[PDB]
Amino acid sequence: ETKCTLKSFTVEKGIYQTSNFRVQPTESIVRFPNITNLCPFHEVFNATRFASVYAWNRKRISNCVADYSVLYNFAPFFAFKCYGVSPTKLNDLCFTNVYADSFVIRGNEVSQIAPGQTGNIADYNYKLPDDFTGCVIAWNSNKLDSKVSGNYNYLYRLFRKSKLKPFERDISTEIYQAGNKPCNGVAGFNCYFPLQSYGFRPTYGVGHQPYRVVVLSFELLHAPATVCGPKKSTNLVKNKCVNFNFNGLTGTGVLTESNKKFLPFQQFGRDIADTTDAVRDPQTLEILDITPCSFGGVSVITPGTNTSNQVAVLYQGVNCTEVPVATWRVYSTGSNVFQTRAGCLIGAEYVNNSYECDIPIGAGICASYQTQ
Amino acid sequence: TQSYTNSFTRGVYYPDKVFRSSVLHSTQDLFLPFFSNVTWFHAIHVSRFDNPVLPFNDGVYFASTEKSNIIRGWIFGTTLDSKTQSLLIVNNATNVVIKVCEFQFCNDPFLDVLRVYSSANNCTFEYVSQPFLMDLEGKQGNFKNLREFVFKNIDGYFKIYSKHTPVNLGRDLPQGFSALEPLVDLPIGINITRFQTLLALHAYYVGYLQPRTFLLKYNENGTITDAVDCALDPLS
Amino acid sequence: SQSIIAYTMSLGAENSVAYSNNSIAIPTNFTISVTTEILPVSMTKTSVDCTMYICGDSTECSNLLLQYGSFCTQLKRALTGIAVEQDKNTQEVFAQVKQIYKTPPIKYFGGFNFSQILPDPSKPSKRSPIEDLLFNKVLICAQKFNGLTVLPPLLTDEMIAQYTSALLAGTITSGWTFGAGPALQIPFPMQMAYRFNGIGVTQNVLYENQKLIANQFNSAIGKIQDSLSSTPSALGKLQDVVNHNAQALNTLVKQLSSKFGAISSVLNDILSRLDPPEAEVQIDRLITGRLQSLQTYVTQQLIRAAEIRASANLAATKMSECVLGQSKRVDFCGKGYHLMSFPQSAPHGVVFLHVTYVPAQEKNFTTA
Amino acid sequence: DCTMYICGDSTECSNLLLQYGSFCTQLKRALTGIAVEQDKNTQEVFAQVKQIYKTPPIKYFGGFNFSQILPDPSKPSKRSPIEDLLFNKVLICAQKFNGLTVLPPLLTDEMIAQYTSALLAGTITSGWTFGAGPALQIPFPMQMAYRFNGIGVTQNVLYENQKLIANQFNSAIG
Amino acid sequence: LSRLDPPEAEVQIDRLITGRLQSLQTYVTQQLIRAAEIRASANLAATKM
Ligand SMILES: *[C@@H]1O[C@H](CO)[C@@H](O[C@@H]2O[C@H](CO)[C@@H](O[C@@H]3O[C@H](CO)[C@@H](O)[C@H](O)[C@@H]3O)[C@H](O)[C@H]2NC(C)=O)[C@H](O)[C@H]1NC(C)=O
Ligand SMILES: *[C@@H]1O[C@H](CO)[C@@H](O[C@@H]2O[C@H](CO)[C@@H](O)[C@H](O)[C@H]2NC(C)=O)[C@H](O)[C@H]1NC(C)=O
Ligand SMILES: *[C@@H]1O[C@H](CO)[C@@H](O[C@@H]2O[C@H](CO)[C@@H](O)[C@H](O)[C@H]2NC(C)=O)[C@H](O)[C@H]1NC(C)=O
Ligand SMILES: *[C@@H]1O[C@H](CO)[C@@H](O[C@@H]2O[C@H](CO)[C@@H](O)[C@H](O)[C@H]2NC(C)=O)[C@H](O)[C@H]1NC(C)=O
Ligand SMILES: *[C@@H]1O[C@H](CO)[C@@H](O)[C@H](O)[C@H]1NC(C)=O
Ligand SMILES: *[C@@H]1O[C@H](CO)[C@@H](O)[C@H](O)[C@H]1NC(C)=O
Ligand SMILES: *[C@@H]1O[C@H](CO)[C@@H](O)[C@H](O)[C@H]1NC(C)=O
Ligand SMILES: *[C@@H]1O[C@H](CO)[C@@H](O)[C@H](O)[C@H]1NC(C)=O
Numbered sequence A: 001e002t003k004c005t006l007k008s009f010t011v012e013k014g015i016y017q018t019s020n021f022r023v024q025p026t027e028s029i030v031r032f033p034n035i036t037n038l039c040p041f042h043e044v045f046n047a048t049r050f051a052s053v054y055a056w057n058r059k060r061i062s063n064c065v066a067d068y069s070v071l072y073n074f075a076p077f078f079a080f081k082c083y084g085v086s087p088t089k090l091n092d093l094c095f096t097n098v099y100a101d102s103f104v105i106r107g108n109e110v111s112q113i114a115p116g117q118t119g120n121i122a123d124y125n126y127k128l129p130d131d132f133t134g135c136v137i138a139w140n141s142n143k144l145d146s147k148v149s150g151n152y153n154y155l156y157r158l159f160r161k162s163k164l165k166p167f168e169r170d171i172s173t174e175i176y177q178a179g180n181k182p183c184n185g186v187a188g189f190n191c192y193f194p195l196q197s198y199g200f201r202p203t204y205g206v207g208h209q210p211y212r213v214v215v216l217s218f219e220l221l222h223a224p225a226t227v228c229g230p231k232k233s234t235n236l237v238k239n240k241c242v243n244f245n246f247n248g249l250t251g252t253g254v255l256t257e258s259n260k261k262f263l264p265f266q267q268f269g270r271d272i273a274d275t276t277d278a279v280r281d282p283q284t285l286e287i288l289d290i291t292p293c294s295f296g297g298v299s300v301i302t303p304g305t306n307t308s309n310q311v312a313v314l315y316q317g318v319n320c321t322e323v324p325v326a327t328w329r330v331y332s333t334g335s336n337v338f339q340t341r342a343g344c345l346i347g348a349e350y351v352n353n354s355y356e357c358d359i360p361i362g363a364g365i366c367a368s369y370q371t372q
Numbered sequence B: 001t002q003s004y005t006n007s008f009t010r011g012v013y014y015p016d017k018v019f020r021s022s023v024l025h026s027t028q029d030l031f032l033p034f035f036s037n038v039t040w041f042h043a044i045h046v047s048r049f050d051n052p053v054l055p056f057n058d059g060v061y062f063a064s065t066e067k068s069n070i071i072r073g074w075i076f077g078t079t080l081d082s083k084t085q086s087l088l089i090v091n092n093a094t095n096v097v098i099k100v101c102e103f104q105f106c107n108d109p110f111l112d113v114l115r116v117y118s119s120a121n122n123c124t125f126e127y128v129s130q131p132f133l134m135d136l137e138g139k140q141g142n143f144k145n146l147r148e149f150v151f152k153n154i155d156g157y158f159k160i161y162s163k164h165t166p167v168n169l170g171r172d173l174p175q176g177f178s179a180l181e182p183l184v185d186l187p188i189g190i191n192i193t194r195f196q197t198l199l200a201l202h203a204y205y206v207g208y209l210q211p212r213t214f215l216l217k218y219n220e221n222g223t224i225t226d227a228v229d230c231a232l233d234p235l236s
Numbered sequence C: 001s002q003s004i005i006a007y008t009m010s011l012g013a014e015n016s017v018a019y020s021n022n023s024i025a026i027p028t029n030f031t032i033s034v035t036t037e038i039l040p041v042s043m044t045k046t047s048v049d050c051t052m053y054i055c056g057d058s059t060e061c062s063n064l065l066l067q068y069g070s071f072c073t074q075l076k077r078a079l080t081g082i083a084v085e086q087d088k089n090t091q092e093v094f095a096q097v098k099q100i101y102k103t104p105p106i107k108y109f110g111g112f113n114f115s116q117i118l119p120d121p122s123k124p125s126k127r128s129p130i131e132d133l134l135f136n137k138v139l140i141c142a143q144k145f146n147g148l149t150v151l152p153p154l155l156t157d158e159m160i161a162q163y164t165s166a167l168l169a170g171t172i173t174s175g176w177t178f179g180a181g182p183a184l185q186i187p188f189p190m191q192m193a194y195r196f197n198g199i200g201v202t203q204n205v206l207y208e209n210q211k212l213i214a215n216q217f218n219s220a221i222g223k224i225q226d227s228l229s230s231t232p233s234a235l236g237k238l239q240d241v242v243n244h245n246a247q248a249l250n251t252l253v254k255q256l257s258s259k260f261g262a263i264s265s266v267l268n269d270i271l272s273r274l275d276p277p278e279a280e281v282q283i284d285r286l287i288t289g290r291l292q293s294l295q296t297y298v299t300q301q302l303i304r305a306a307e308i309r310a311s312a313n314l315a316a317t318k319m320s321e322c323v324l325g326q327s328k329r330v331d332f333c334g335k336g337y338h339l340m341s342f343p344q345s346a347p348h349g350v351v352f353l354h355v356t357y358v359p360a361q362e363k364n365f366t367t368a
Numbered sequence D: 001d002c003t004m005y006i007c008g009d010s011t012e013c014s015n016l017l018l019q020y021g022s023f024c025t026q027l028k029r030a031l032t033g034i035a036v037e038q039d040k041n042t043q044e045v046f047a048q049v050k051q052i053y054k055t056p057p058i059k060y061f062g063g064f065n066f067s068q069i070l071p072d073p074s075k076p077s078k079r080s081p082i083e084d085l086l087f088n089k090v091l092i093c094a095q096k097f098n099g100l101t102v103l104p105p106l107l108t109d110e111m112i113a114q115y116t117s118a119l120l121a122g123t124i125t126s127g128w129t130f131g132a133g134p135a136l137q138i139p140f141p142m143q144m145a146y147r148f149n150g151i152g153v154t155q156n157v158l159y160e161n162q163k164l165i166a167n168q169f170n171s172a173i174g
Numbered sequence E: 001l002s003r004l005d006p007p008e009a010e011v012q013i014d015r016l017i018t019g020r021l022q023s024l025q026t027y028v029t030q031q032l033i034r035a036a037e038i039r040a041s042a043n044l045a046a047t048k049m
């Protein structure tokens, strides 16, 4: 490795740095609350009547177990575009608050429901924010949501004075003002009806039929999570380098015990470096302290290829007693372990004599190729 | 009957739900400025009522020292009419009957020489829970309990913080420091711009918040003990 | 009854001299004084790892760290060079003597009192009282968990004191000879007579006024400890170095929590909330931001190390000239005529105690 | 100033200046350190004397002529003739309107001349003694004799050849 | 800021900000390097005085 890090077949006498080492995690643990009640998703997708376009039926999903697999009972899925998050990882996530908006449109405008897009539905009926996160779903409903004479229940806005700000219903039967005649409710020439109706019949085709669309909006931030995926809980392990997934807080640690005095309304913990330090167990409601995982560089002490081919390692600032990483099989060599202030020295003895210094190490110690 | 006084150093609340110790963290948010002008309202009808509707903007700091249950509830919303959506809060002995039912009239006292929500048509979210206004009595009236509340709403949700202080012993808005622990954070999407208070038959402060930058100090127990403004004085 | 008052800067007391054709002024008394000088010698060694810092424990992020050439085989070399020169600085400053000398058992030097600077065997640390005061007037684990490591110097602060003790014991029983050839013994009053003979004063002045000179030296050395312990900021140069290094590390580690025009500042969050194929957009922004934030730190460190090497060189020169001999340069080894100097260690620095000669009482005369 | 330079008087631009960490709390510190050391440099160079000395009224130093370097009371600036030549051989507002400010030094060029005058008046009536202890008077020819005695030349050379040396000095300074 | 609306205006502004940040960091570094070599001369001037 020393010959590889610096391009040569002959390394001069001295000390060199090659690479780093880190302790490796052993097992994975997942902790979730006892909440088991299913979410009302199965009702919002499977309903009888949907609202109009200008007045959508916004719903808020409270705390429950959400299974993002029941919605797959709907086969077609004309569009399943997810913007903020990847759909595949939708199951293994936790959200703060979830909004669902369901309504019905025509095919030619199904592509219009997206951030940063303009038109008639996207400007006069429903505008999404540019930084929107969530998913959109659309399916075909011509065969069971149409009449031979047609359905005129659904109407969409066509004329508006000003651009619609995102997430703003505009239910208002105000007569359009055009031309130069101040209409006072005449609703005649130059004063149009803002809402125009639809007609749905089984004789139409794709792009001329009603499609049912539902949009889900999320928000991810440090807050008590109410909606979570159906991932199974696990057990608790302490004083061992493990990776944890506490309610969205994922990362490696040791998870010792703590003596902190968290207030009853606090959840997380921080430090002067704005890094997570302490956590509150979702189920047992105790306080755990998260200290990171032993890591550090390594060094090789060589007397030079001209003399010999025997080396020693200088694991920087890790205790030999517990974690000397115990791959080139030089670990805890018999009678070759020395615990100095610099770190773990493997491959050299420690005599009680004193000579001049050849290869400095640290805190005052020197290595040499002295003969017996 | 409106009197005026000095708000002193008051109205500091925990901005986030995290734990910090021995930190000098500084944050920018809606706060009550130091040494602001607080209006001491006054009314009495125990000799209908003698108070019009107060304006609401950027939240309200509300403090009072009542006897047992004289002042109970609050009314929020626009125009306080049964055409728009309004919020009601009533604090009785055992529960809170907070609701977002639509109403315009909810009180027919008729003091001699309930009738709550007289017209409630289309109700909405309810959050019945433990009562807010509770007091402990040491069988002496030397120390009058002081109750402080902060109401605000930003990007959804209704944030209500509160604190009790038995330290007061005869002064209005005393010198000292006391942070407010969060109590209620419930979700409502209605639009609020007008504010009024209730009163029980058979003392009243109003403030206003502004966007300011504060610097707060935490102790080793995680409790805020001091805070400084960054616009009041050049030394600050 | 106080208020802030603004005035015009002054320059000093107006003085007038009475120069004439035949008029001279000669002093009739002297005054031995002790000055003090403080010099930084070295900062704290440090090392930074790119991979753990820029792309924490993520092979997906580490793969994208390529296509940037080798921007991290040079930062390591620069930091290693800085650490090596930091190790060399103290070796240059202190290791001026080939051997180690021991203080004599019986301490009696013509009446002079050196107990304030000689090692005290009572305390196990084996340090002079002045060094104790210097050691008592001059978040850590968080940086350890981000790839920033702090290395120990290759001279523990228990053999540096040995070097200082050897120098100070050689300079009181051998004069300046031990800096050129073999050490040669000489009584202390004779050495002071020789030092007086080097600033144009005959030696008979010393031997006729010895008790007074010894008392003046003792009084001068007595109050320097009080002045050091009572001045609000005397060791103000070393603390500036420590504060600058701590602030640099703090502002480097704080930069990790910045969006840099990306959705989040956490690699785990972006790696779990999004799929690979479009995830190499935010990661690039984070990598670029962190690369700039680390290059700035390295450049600042190089610039700061230059100005501390430029001071370590001066400290070495002052040790070679003021201590191992007598310096004729004006106003170099302290104000006034120079007699001798003593070194003392301090955390990442040295403190020189200069002994200087100053005339006291003038008298007018007529000359031809 | 970062804000006026990078995003001139535009709150919309200033909002985007975040998400870059603190890249402008360090430039201010660096520039402040540079300014402080610039102020310290001249203080270190010039302020070598604790007191301020005055030139004697009657000027006659063994025949030497110092009028070319001593302050001239005729000009109100109180500067030597040589300093006048040095001062006469060594778009501005546009930079002021971009956030780049120029600060004045904390020594006006009318008390630096006082420091130089004090040094030069001390060095001709006291020799080198005023740099170590109290200033002591001494005639100028005696001082030159002492200075000759310091380069391995006996003093009797000076006192036997004085007018010639004075003329050579005057011609050299001219 | 006047010819375009906010929502897509945060594209050119980023380029301007980046360019100006680099152009100012270069100036600061040059100033530090130049100040070092003038301090190194002020010290010599003080010694010579
Ligand atoms: C040259 O300067 C030295 C230092 O000041 C002079 O020595 C000091 O002389 C004064 C005058 O007597 C002493 O003050 C008195 O001393 C007696 C001693 O018992 C004391 O009882 C009085 O309360 C008062 O302090 C002073 O002690 C003495 N300094 C020392 C260290 O002994 C010296 O006299 C001067 N030379 C000439 C020729 O005047
Ligand atoms: C040396 O002699 C000169 C001249 O006699 C002294 O200077 C005078 O001192 C007296 C007494 O204080 C003053 O009244 C005069 O005004 C001084 N003359 C001038 C031109 O300044 C001088 O003080 C004597 N030296 C010492 C040390 O006293
Ligand atoms: C040298 O100075 C030290 C400190 O001033 C002297 O130590 C003091 O000695 C006196 C008398 O013996 C004691 O009353 C003090 O308590 C001592 N102080 C300390 C801090 O120990 C020492 O005696 C002096 N040396 C000689 C030879 O007199
Ligand atoms: C010192 O030198 C100056 C300048 O050379 C002399 O000033 C000149 O004096 C002569 C005769 O008095 C005049 O003709 C010149 O016009 C003067 N020149 C200037 C620029 O003023 C001065 O006289 C010399 N000092 C003495 C004592 O002779
Ligand atoms: C959908 O709902 C109807 C009634 O609301 C019910 O009869 C039907 O079984 C449901 N089907 C699915 C797949 O949920
Ligand atoms: C979850 O259930 C366990 C089993 O009874 C119980 O000990 C624990 O307190 C419960 N936690 C919550 C948050 O309901
Ligand atoms: C050691 O280096 C010298 C240098 O030229 C070389 O000649 C010699 O062969 C080397 N030793 C061995 C064993 O190769
Ligand atoms: C290893 O050393 C560290 C510090 O030197 C210490 O904290 C730790 O307890 C040691 N290991 C054991 C098993 O004692």
Ligand SMILES: *[C@@H]1O[C@H](CO)[C@@H](O)[C@H](O)[C@H]1NC(C)=O
Residues within 6 Å of the ligand: A351, A352
């Ligand atoms: C060397 O010193 C160590 C530390 O005191 C001690 O444990 C060891 O026994 C010594 N070895 C010998 C041979 O004296």
Ligand SMILES: *[C@@H]1O[C@H](CO)[C@@H](O)[C@H](O)[C@H]1NC(C)=O
Residues within 6 Å of the ligand: B004, B005, B006, B037
């Ligand atoms: C508060 O406002 C009133 C009305 O202008 C004014 O009279 C009073 O002085 C103000 N309070 C203070 C402390 O200035």
Ligand SMILES: *[C@@H]1O[C@H](CO)[C@@H](O)[C@H](O)[C@H]1NC(C)=O
Residues within 6 Å of the ligand: B092, B093, B094, B095, B096, B097
């Ligand atoms: C308080 O209100 C709750 C909720 O309506 C009610 O059940 C309870 O009886 C009330 N108690 C009193 C004393 O009015």
Ligand SMILES: *[C@@H]1O[C@H](CO)[C@@H](O)[C@H](O)[C@H]1NC(C)=O
Residues within 6 Å of the ligand: B083, B121, B122
């Ligand atoms: C309240 O509900 C009734 C019936 O549920 C409805 O007729 C009325 O329009 C509603 N009020 C509104 C929507 O303002």
Ligand SMILES: *[C@@H]1O[C@H](CO)[C@@H](O)[C@H](O)[C@H]1NC(C)=O
Residues within 6 Å of the ligand: B078, B191, B192, B193
């Ligand atoms: C709230 O209602 C008032 C009055 O109807 C209106 O002026 C204001 O714009 C509304 N605010 C919001 C956020 O809807």
Ligand SMILES: *[C@@H]1O[C@H](CO)[C@@H](O)[C@H](O)[C@H]1NC(C)=O
Residues within 6 Å of the ligand: B219, B220, B221
């Ligand atoms: C922290 O709480 C403990 C527990 O009662 C108490 O003893 C200590 O005084 C408190 N310290 C502070 C600063 O509040």
Ligand SMILES: *[C@@H]1O[C@H](CO)[C@@H](O)[C@H](O)[C@H]1NC(C)=O
Residues within 6 Å of the ligand: C020, C021, C022, D060
């Ligand atoms: C000094 O010498 C000059 C030159 O002759 C003379 O003019 C002056 O009067 C003398 N002053 C004294 C005090 O002797």
